[PDB]
Point group: D2
Chain length 417, copies 4
């Protein structure tokens, strides 16, 4: 069966899935090869992803490859109910995902997914893989391998490995070049600001925007905030990215110093409680806080709730916390991934590459069944490079190639002066 | 002895060396530790570097550490004669380097350097190390290790390794994070445009500027060309950087298509004959070509000379090649590293980090004498990270550090939802 | 009476009106004074504006001042039905505005508005003023004066004046410094991209975006498109803005050349048939065209409809036209101003200044009745400057002030050598 | 006679003058017409300009037109001695200009220039016109008219007019669209940074740069500082440019707040004592201060000299002031316009338009002698626009032209619904 909001939304989901496919040409080619080669024939698969038009196109590709797939939501607020309905009604793919579902429903959906007895698990944040290892030790004989879509998930997998419980292959999709160089940076840079603006309609120009973290996501958010006319502050914990942010023209300072100055705060660290009650207490009246890291725990909303004398919903996706002194803190999307909670996530152009990696990583797991060491594996270089070749070609961009003499010069070392 | 232009220039060199030191605080701390610990006592050292105020401060640091050093020019056009004179007259460091010296003088200087019988060779482009391996097999028992400053040199060292002749440790200074993330990118981005403008006084705004290569240097040049108002075209041979350039807002195309459009061409590829006679023949009348890769071979100037009916020097560092149809091609700095030939190279702020790596790499070689495998070694992570910590501190920038609970969250994998 | 979609939407409208007011502090101050001084007591007023949360705050300020106002939509597609419901239900202000109303309904609303016998007309695009002068010459004795919000309307007023029929005072709100320096530039720059992204979810980075016109709006749209990673082409008819665009780093060319290259076309010229059938014929398959000028006539959609062999809606606000050769053209918002048709228009921060100018322009007409010549009048400098001073204060920015010594220097001509 | 440093520099001057002419095609066209029509036959002319390769091309165009010209320096530090030598030796044009001349020599040169009894005075900063009106009332019958190149001079002319002593026509060259939209913005933006970098070699990326003034010059300097990776602070006295700076992404604050934060200070206000002792007192150790306004009086250097306990030159164009508390302030170019004092001023591409305006303004004064009122006159629109059309053509850029149908639409007011 399935567990969705409204199956009558399927026609609208189909229209939007097909619209998104227009900028997923790499995944389309993979789908067309999968439909002939059937790499997943006889394989059961669980996907824990954001239920978007882009994930739909991925599920359609795995289905064309023969996968017996079950899809559940990676986050209660990111689900697109029309997409869920189209996958069920048009493709017969079980989806357990309702926008705005409560925590008990999420956890029940994880339990249903694990009862599918998957041979492959595609995860986004590593919730299902962690539950599998914790609660389903008897099922590990089913697992051919897993994949992980996002940075937070890769961190949890390293913790599982160092703890000694990562006893199967896990594909590091997030760290492929054609994943986090584009998705994490250019995707999050546009879609994060998109979610902020759809929720608040705020003018970004002239605002001070504090970006916590200057990794791939932070670089993208800061770059686009700057492009929209914001004054950008960056916080960090490591010196190499801090120097980069300064040489990119941004102010770098500790969060305790930024807290007095920011009009908008955006967390993209992967870590817990980056924005804290001692920061809330000194923020400007009306400061906006939101999160684009995988988990809402980057903002200590539990503490905010007890500092505040009152909380009100003042717009879709927008809560106003009023403190005893009468100042307000605005929270978007209850601290959930603001690009997916208040908008539609990354454009399909970058998910084409992220989800091409997902599809080919699953294929890599199956074709190497019984042959991979336990632990984390990076995406093979030749796969990563081929995705980039196909994407560049699909964008209509042509580049150069070395001549035979240029190749010879590379291998000569006596040639200098 | 020494071989320099004019030792009466020493006072001016000293003034300029001390000016440059103001933004080399990391190297100063290393120098002050070196002067007490004397890591290089009894060690002979050859440096093949650009003879600039920044290299001078490096040589002063090695001298304080006890090194018996001899300095020669990495390039005939990059030498600063006042610096050469100050090093000889004020520090007693033999310098063999005359701005504008001919090719025979360069090669004689290399021979003199190798007769110093160095135990350590600091190289920039790998000319001296290649000559050592080619011509001085009997001297290899002297070598404790070598270092290489630039990307072109790292490529030659890989070729030496694959050929089986890299029989000693070579430190990869260029690829340290605190080297090519800053020097290669932000340094070249500013200093390349600096050299173009000092040579030509051209307005960059409104010009089409073709950047060949989108590695660390190409990213920097394109970013600053854009910042100065230029329309930027990027050429490449690999899809991952080509997609980056497009998502950074630049036009990507093959050089044969760019050749018709560019007002200024800048090569930063590391490869041979990237700009070719078939490109010259279709360039706009008055197009400017220059090179910021280590070797002038990136532009096929030999072919340009035979296509042209006439060449004239029309300004300092500036040659006009007139073709039979009357169109002109402008070449800056005879195709040598335009930032160092027509200006003063990178700012000392980034060379602080590059040359801190050089100093600590030499120390690493000495303290591990007889203990390192032959071949290339990367800069130890703890060294690289400490340089970044000290530089950030010296720039007056403070950042955050994780709390104990944040560290615990990193190592928990069961914590999701 | 009134003519709206659904009065039950009033609670949501009220909430959204209050949210927008958070960044309209200058208009709030004006409303509070109007509440005390009642400058519009006994005055009947018609407003033809986009029926948005920002217009609602203006209407509430006019209401506080005693104006007997009637509001109609400036564009069938920009109306926010929840705003219309709140103005009727909560303030008792007659609104004639239904999102998506047909042309006959819009025209009927204009007739009903003129039947209100306004003393003041606030117009956005000059439709109501033109209908008054063409059809209601017998009502001109009612008119104290009118105001005009946008550049297209000013051009119409100019033609009326040159035609001898602008026989009453008309305030040029659009050309106030605190209107078109911010609204037209920074507001359109952000909200045009907002509309495009809400409609299509497209990644802007790496796309070629053609901006027709490099006036206040074109400068903002090109600036923000570039900030979002686009490759930007600008078209023009006048050399001064064309040179500016080039020195701002954009590619300038005739539309016939741009037509082959653009992925997205945005018209902001104020002129008719800037994109024509001969341009559609050479566009890439799937090129997107939209308009941010006041009237959709900037794109020759009538010819596109005749050219095309079929048209279908492929997403909300998004139509696909298929040409007889099978290539497709995507049109957003039926060519109506894409920021208001597919999103929510400008942020309230800039509309604060635009509509402060509207409020004080209406006050100016009433306070100076019988002392203003017929024809166009600019916003008094003292008013324009006070709006800027108050907005800068409300943004929390402090600046310097001239000293007596500096004033003396300005008035001194003999000094300086 | 003449008064120059060294006539033997003429060959180098000639070469550099010819090089600069490559991007002065509009002035070349004007010179060629002047050579034919001789508009200045019998006219005596004085030019007080920066003695640069660009001014030389203007002087050559006036010479071609028959003008009996005499040229003196506009600033003791901007003079290019090789240019002065070429104008004397090759063209026989009297030049009174020595780079680094003292104040008494500058004043003597102004007296010699007025002794030429000019009919036309071209001024840059209005010193010669002010000296004429103060000291040479008996010569006013000589004057056909004057021109003024820069914003400071316009302000002086305004004060003269308000004082009743501007009794002849004076052409406002600075405020022509093709002058201050490009020269003041794009030229100053690039050449100010050029001067700073030539003097100091400092890395701009990661520095905090304070720009005083957000007019045409301030907009350009802030834009290019940001493009080079700086963190940019803007100071102002008027709210309209202050809001613009904020929405352009810069931090706006009073100079007293900026004084603690800046690494580099750049004054472009046109006003006196913008940086004062109370600012020097709180600057970072080693802060750099420079001026790109016409007169050095924007920085209170006289007070700094009194405050300081010592001063020394630490590099070409670079002085270190040491305060009694041991902190140091670095001054570039003795506070004289840093683009011309430490580099070569604007690129010839923008001076092409500025000096085309100068040439045609002088022609306008002669052709309209006896028909111009005393007081200031703007450049005729037709002249301003033709300069733009010719420059855009010479840049190789093509744009569109209105059709008959579009013209009809502009003049139609009844249409649009
Ligand atoms: N919302 C989206 O669509 C989306 C897309 C990709 C990734 N993500 C998430 O975004 C987060 C960041 O991912 P990434 O790829 O940028 O990771 P990354 O590893 O490249 O960068 C994270 C950066 O944050 C810094 N940081 C860590 N703790 C910090 C703290 N307390 N304060 C300040 N800086 C701190 C780190 O030093 C590092 O530079 C992850 O949770 C990832 O799963 C979200
Ligand atoms: N002048 C300076 O001060 C300075 C500073 C640092 C490095 N360098 C030199 O600059 C060069 C580039 O170094 P880097 O660190 O950027 O290297 P890199 O390895 O990071 O990047 C080089 C890039 O050029 C591309 N490329 C190679 N051949 C090409 C071709 N024929 N056409 C187009 N693109 C091509 C490669 O794909 C790669 O992306 C080297 O020669 C290096 O030694 C100079
Ligand atoms: N959607 C919005 O919210 C919004 C906001 C403000 C203004 N507007 C509208 O935007 C339009 C432009 O306003 P503006 O203030 O930028 O006007 P403007 O007068 O400042 O600029 C218009 C520019 O377009 C150029 N142009 C004219 N015809 C052209 C053509 N055929 N091709 C190319 N360039 C051409 C002109 O040379 C000029 O530079 C008007 O219709 C105005 O009412 C819309
Ligand atoms: N060096 C060059 O090559 C060059 C080129 C053009 C102009 N200039 C000079 O630059 C100066 C500025 O010219 P412009 O065209 O930009 O003038 P402008 O009138 O366009 O702008 C001056 C700006 O400075 C602001 N301002 C005035 N006093 C101030 C103060 N005390 N603090 C902060 N801001 C203040 C004004 O509000 C205004 O916005 C003039 O002296 C002009 O002659 C120099
Ligand atoms: N449109 C989208 N559809 C599906 N997943 C998305 C979308 N946007 C972002 N994501 C993914 O969500 C992850 C964060 O949980 C990111 O790693 C990213 O790949
Ligand atoms: N100012 C400078 N002094 C010394 N070396 C430099 C300077 N600028 C650039 N370089 C170095 O020259 C190398 C290229 O040969 C680069 O790797 C870079 O580190
Ligand atoms: N949010 C908005 N509310 C009302 N009017 C708007 C809004 N956004 C843009 N406009 C106005 O619409 C006009 C174009 O019809 C512009 O002049 C602008 O002032
Ligand atoms: N290269 C140059 N040659 C001559 N005048 C210049 C140059 N650069 C700037 N100026 C002028 O100097 C004036 C300031 O004194 C500016 O108005 C500008 O037009
Ligand atoms: Cl494939
Ligand atoms: Cl150390
Ligand atoms: Cl008021
Ligand atoms: Cl002419
Ligand atoms: Rb080689
Ligand atoms: Rb965790
Ligand atoms: Rb049709
Ligand atoms: Rb003065
Ligand atoms: Rb003193
Ligand atoms: Rb019209």
């Amino acid at each position: 069966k399935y567990d969705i909001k409204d199956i009558s939304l399927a026609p609208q989901g189909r229209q939007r899935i097909e619209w998104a496919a227009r900028e997923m040409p790499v995944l389309k080619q993979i789908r067309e090869r999968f439909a002939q080669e059937k790499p997943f024939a006889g394989i059961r698969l669980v996907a824990c992803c954001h239920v978007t038009t882009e994930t739909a196109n991925l599920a359609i590709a795995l289905h064309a490859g023969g996968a017996d797939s079950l899809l559940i939501a990676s986050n209660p607020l990111s689900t697109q109910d029309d997409v869920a309905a189209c996958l069920v009604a048009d493709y017969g793919i079980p989806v357990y995902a309702i926008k705005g579902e409560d925590n008990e429903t999420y956890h029940r959906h994880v339990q249903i997914a694990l009862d599918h007895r998957p041979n492959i698990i595609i995860d986004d944040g590593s919730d299902v893989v962690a539950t599998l290892v914790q609660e389903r030790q008897h099922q590990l004989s089913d697992i051919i391998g897993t994949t992980e879509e996002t940075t937070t998930g890769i961190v949890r997998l390293r913790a599982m490995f160092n703890d000694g419980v990562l006893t199967f292959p896990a594909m590091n999709v997030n760290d492929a070049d054609t994943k986090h160089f584009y998705d994490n940076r250019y995707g999050t840079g546009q879609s994060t600001l998109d979610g902020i603006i759809r929720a608040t309609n705020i003018l970004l120009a002239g605002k001070t925007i504090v970006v916590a973290g200057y990794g791939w996501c932070g670089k993208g958010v800061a770059m686009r905030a700057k492009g929209m006319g914001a004054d950008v502050i960056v916080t960090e914990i490591s010196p190499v990215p801090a120097i980069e942010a300064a040489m990119d023209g941004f102010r770098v300072m500790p969060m305790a110093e930024a807290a007095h100055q920011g009009d908008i705060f955006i967390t993209v660290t992967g870590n817990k409680h980056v924005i804290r009650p001692e920061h809330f207490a000194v923020m400007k009246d009306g400061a906006i806080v939101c999160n684009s890291g995988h988990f809402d725990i980057e903002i200590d909303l539990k503490s905010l709730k007890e500092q505040a004398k009152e909380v009100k919903e003042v717009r879709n996706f927008t809560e106003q916390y009023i403190l005893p002194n009468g100042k307000s803190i605005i929270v978007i999307g209850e601290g959930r991934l603001v690009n997916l909670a208040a908008a539609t996530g990354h454009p399909s152009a970058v998910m084409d590459m992220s989800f091409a990696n997902q599809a080919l990583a699953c294929e890599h797991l199956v074709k190497n069944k019984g042959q991979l060491e336990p632990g984390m594996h990076s995406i093979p270089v030749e796969v990563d490079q081929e995705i980039a070749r196909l994407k560049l070609q699909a964008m209509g961009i042509a580049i150069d190639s070395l001549t035979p003499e240029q190749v010879e010069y590379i291998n000569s070392w006596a040639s200098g002066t």
